[PDB]
Each structure stands twice: as structure tokens, then as C-alpha cells.
Paper text:
[name] is an essential NAP in Caulobacter crescentus involved in DNA replication, chromosome segregation and cell division. In this paper we present three crystal structures of [name] from C. crescentus, crystallised in the presence of double-stranded DNA with a sequence from the origin of chromosome replication. In all three structures, [name] adopts the same overall tetramer ring form as seen by Guo et al., albeit with small but important increases in the diameter of the central channel. DNA could not be visualized in any of our three structures, but DNA could be detected in gel electrophoresis, indicating that DNA is present in the crystals.
For this, we used both full length [name] and [name]Δ1-11 (a construct in which we removed the first eleven residues, that were predicted to be disordered) and a 19-bp dsDNA oligomer with a sequence from the C. crescentus origin of replication, which [name] binds with a nanomolar dissociation constant. We were also able to solve the structure of [name]Δ1-11 from crystals of space group P4322. Diffraction from these crystals also showed high anisotropy, with resolution limits between 3.3 Å and 3.8 Å. Following ellipsoidal truncation and anisotropic correction using the Diffraction Anisotropy Server10 the structure was refined to an Rfree of 0.322. There are six monomers in the asymmetric unit, arranged as a tetramer and a dimer. The tetramer could be overlaid onto the I4132 tetramer with an rmsd of 1.9 Å. Crystallographic symmetry again showed that the dimer of the asymmetric unit paired with symmetry-related molecules to form tetramers. Furthermore, in the I4132 and P4322 structures, a 19 bp DNA oligio would have to adopt substantial bends to thread through the central channel of adjacent tetramers, because channels formed by adjacent [name] tetramers do not line up. The main difference between [name] in the three crystal forms arises from slight changes in the orientation of helix three, which results in minor variations in the size of the central channel.
Author numbering:
A (entry chain B), B (entry chain B): 12 to 88
C (entry chain A), D (entry chain A): 12 to 87
Write the structure that this text describes.
């Protein structure tokens, strides 16, 4: 490669690595939060469920819940 | 639940949501970096490959490369 | 390597590849099944949800649903 | 729903569940195969690497390896 692409390559790699570090840090902090959360007697799986359903559209969520209920009753299961 | 667990639940949820936001932001920034990187004529897949192999132990990496080469030659493929 | 390990390696690789092919077939067929499911006006995502929750223990399922609802009501 | 869609739903669910079971069998067998592979002193990860790279086009594989090496040499 040329000197330009060499320096650009080093730059890109370094910036990406830094961002990955910050990202990893955030992830670890989240894990810490869930750890103390479990440290207060909360169900982490259910908490993650709440987080997952609070990102979804409420209308489509309640829709999928209604359809779900419908399907479960439709088969007797 | 009791008022304590209610407030703690709200707190946990809010903090986790914030951390998720920061995390998402970091991810988006990474995507931006790879976008301008591709904007300079670089192979993003290969870049990700470099990032992935720069996290691994060099000794075990070169090991797996030697073993790989060995296996490929062993079968004529 | 020695010739023995070479032939054995070829064997292993072939075995794994064949199993991977069969796995691919299964996945493709499943894809076709869900396509047939939506072709009759069914929600594929919800169907997958039904399948995934039928793998879980029912008592723990209705339990986790109860805890979920409890928390959601706790925060509105 | 109507009785027809109820029976059809039962059918679909059963079909999907059976396919999932067969898929599980395939995965379990693969697990057994790699266990047999390491039982003869082979690197399972590297074997999986061989399998995964044999799915890719060889020209593009050796090409991506060349670009990789080029970049790594470019940065040492």
C-alpha cells in the first residue's frame, strides 16, 4: 500500500478498537447493574424480558399477545 | 410489591435503558467509522477480520493457522 | 501428518459436511413450512413464539408471565 | 378462530415441532462427531474452521486471505 492508506489503516483500526473498548465498558456496567439488581432479589431474566418488551411497539405487542392467546386457546394447549 | 421495590425497579430499568442508549450510540459510531472506511476504498469484512484476529492470542492464532495449513495439506484440499 | 491421519481427516471432514447438508435441508423445509403457514394468514413470529414456549416448562412459563405482569403493573 | 383453523393450527404446530426435533438430532450427532474428532487428538475449532471455509468460494477465500495478509503486513 501507499503511506496514505497505511496511516488511514492505522487510524481506522485504532478508532474502532477504542470504540469497542468503550462499548465493552458499557456492557460490563450493564452486567454490574444486573448483578446488584439480582443483589436486591429481582429476577434478571424477567427484567431482561421487560427491557425487551419496552422497546417494542405497544400496539403490536398487545397484538402479538392477543394472537398468542388466541392460538393457545385454539389448540387447547 | 412494596414502595421500596417499586422505586428500585424504576431505578434499575432507567439505568439499564440509559446504558443501552450509550451502547447503541457507540455501535452507531462504529458503523459510521466502517462507513467512511469503506468510503476510503477499504474492505470492511477484511477489516473486521483484522479486528477479530487482533483480539486473539498471537501464539494460539499462529498455532491455529499452522494446524489449519497442516489439515488443508493433509487432505489435498 | 501421517497417511492414516490424512485419510481419517478426510473421513471426518466428509462426515461433518454431510451432516451440515442435512441440517441445511431441515432449515430449508422449516422455512417452507412457515411460508405455508403465512400463506394461510397466520402470524409466523407468533407461531415461532408458540413453538419456543412449548419447549419451556409450562409452570415456569406461566410463572414468568406472572412475574412479568407483576413488574409491569408495578411500573404501569 | 373456527374449528378448521384450530385443527390446521394443531397440524402446523406439530409439523414444526417434529422438524425441530429432527434438527436437534442432527445437532446432537454433530456434537458427537466433533467429540469423536477430538478423541483422536484433533483441534475441533480448526476443524469447524475448515468446514466453514469449504462453504465459501475458494478464489474469494484465498483472495481475502491475501488482503488480510496485505493489511497485516501494512501495519506489521
Amino acid at each position: 500500500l501507499n503511506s496514505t492508506a497505511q496511516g488511514q489503516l492505522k487510524s481506522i483500526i485504532e478508532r474502532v478498537e477504542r470504540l469497542e473498548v468503550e462499548k465493552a465498558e458499557i456492557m460490563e456496567q450493564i452486567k454490574e447493574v444486573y448483578a446488584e439488581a439480582k443483589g436486591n432479589g429481582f429476577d434478571v431474566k424477567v427484567l431482561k424480558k421487560v427491557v425487551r418488551i419496552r422497546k417494542q411497539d405497544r400496539a403490536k405487542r398487545q397484538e402479538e399477545d392477543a394472537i398468542l392467546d388466541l392460538y393457545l386457546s385454539a389448540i387447547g394447549e
